[PDB]
């Protein structure tokens, strides 16, 4: 992927959802590496799932960052080096 090329996915999903003006879209394109639109769409969708937990219809910057750490990796077996080979 590319930093600017992925932004087409970020900007498209963000147009169909409500986001605060303090939300930084450049922090997602730099940190994410080799990911598809399905993972990106789950980030903005989790932001709404984190918003309904707080009973706030407007997604703020806090709900955007808290939703990124959950959807960044779906693999539970990662660990780090714990099991060699």
């Amino acid at each position: 992927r590319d930093r600017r090329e992925r932004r087409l996915i970020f900007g498209t999903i963000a147009s169909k959802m409500s986001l605060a003006p303090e939300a930084d879209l450049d922090s997602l394109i730099i940190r994410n590496d080799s990911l598809s639109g399905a993972v990106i769409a789950a980030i903005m969708q989790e932001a709404g799932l984190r918003a309904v937990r707080k009973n706030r219809y407007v997604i703020l910057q806090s709900d955007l960052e808290e939703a990124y750490a959950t959807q960044v990796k779906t693999d539970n077996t990662v660990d780090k080096f714990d099991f060699y080979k």
């Binding site: 590496d33 080096f81 060699y84 080979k85």
Partner: protein, 250 residues
């Protein structure tokens, strides 16, 4: 899956190639990525190192060791496999050569003896093959600079540019099309840093990256002065602090 006879080192493989050999490369492929670039005036090697815990010491891990002052080495794989192999390889190099010809072994003789231990590891029963792949870079007065890719099967072949580990196939196409034999060592260092950076972009500094080159003699590393005849060590391992200086000029 099919036949265990391919896995048994005392039994010939029904498929024509020992399954223990092909799946040992998978263990090497699961490891980190190590590569090398052979030029006319020198050979550069670069690899990525295990970070482990955030409190782990980055200066403890050294993946580039010293065999002879004219020959370097780099490995990717298990920790003890390289240690036990080279600890015996340094003894065979001294006994079969330095205790006979009284010098440091050349490139063709040293690499041939390293693969012989892997041959016995894949032959005698009960001894598992090594899970490491050694990329040996050296310079002599006969063949000159040489870069040999040593596979755990025990078969070595010369390579101008090669890579091992998970990025073996990925960097092989890169190093083939990017690099040409007519270039120098200075351009080889910059290309080695760009290809290795593609493996992980998190930390490219000298803490997780080791860099070493081969070339002419260094008078500061000889340890003694007054003899013009004996040249200094041809191998120079760059300190992690000096690696960052090369990265700023990349």
């Amino acid at each position: 899956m099919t036949d265990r006879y391919s896995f048994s080192l005392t039994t010939f493989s029904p498929s024509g190639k020992l399954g223990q050999i092909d799946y040992a490369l998978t263990a090497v492929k699961q490891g980190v990525t190590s590569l090398g670039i052979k030029a006319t005036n020198g050979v550069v090697i670069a690899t990525e190192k295990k970070s482990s815990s955030p409190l782990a010491m980055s200066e403890t891990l050294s993946k580039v060791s010293l065999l002879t002052p004219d020959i370097g080495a780099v490995y990717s794989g298990m920790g003890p496999d390289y240690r036990v192999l080279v600890d015996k390889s340094r003894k065979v190099a001294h006994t079969s050569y330095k205790r006979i010809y009284g010098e440091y072994p050349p490139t063709k003789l040293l690499v041939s003896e390293v693969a012989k231990i892997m041959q016995e590891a894949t032959q005698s029963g009960g001894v598992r093959p090594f899970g490491v792949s050694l990329l040996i870079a050296g310079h002599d007065e006969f063949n000159g600079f040489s870069l040999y890719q040593v596979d755990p099967s025990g078969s070595y072949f010369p390579w101008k540019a090669t890579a091992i580990g998970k990025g073996s196939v990925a960097a092989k196409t890169f190093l083939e099309k990017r690099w040409n034999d007519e270039l120098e060592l200075e351009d080889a260092i910059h290309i080695a840093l760009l290809t290795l950076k593609e493996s992980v972009e998190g930390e490219f500094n000298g803490d997780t990256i080791e860099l070493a080159i081969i070339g002419d003699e260094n008078p500061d590393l000889l340890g003694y002065t007054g003899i013009p005849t004996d040249k200094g060590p041809r191998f120079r391992k760059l300190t992690s602090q000096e690696i960052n200086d090369r990265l700023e000029a990349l």
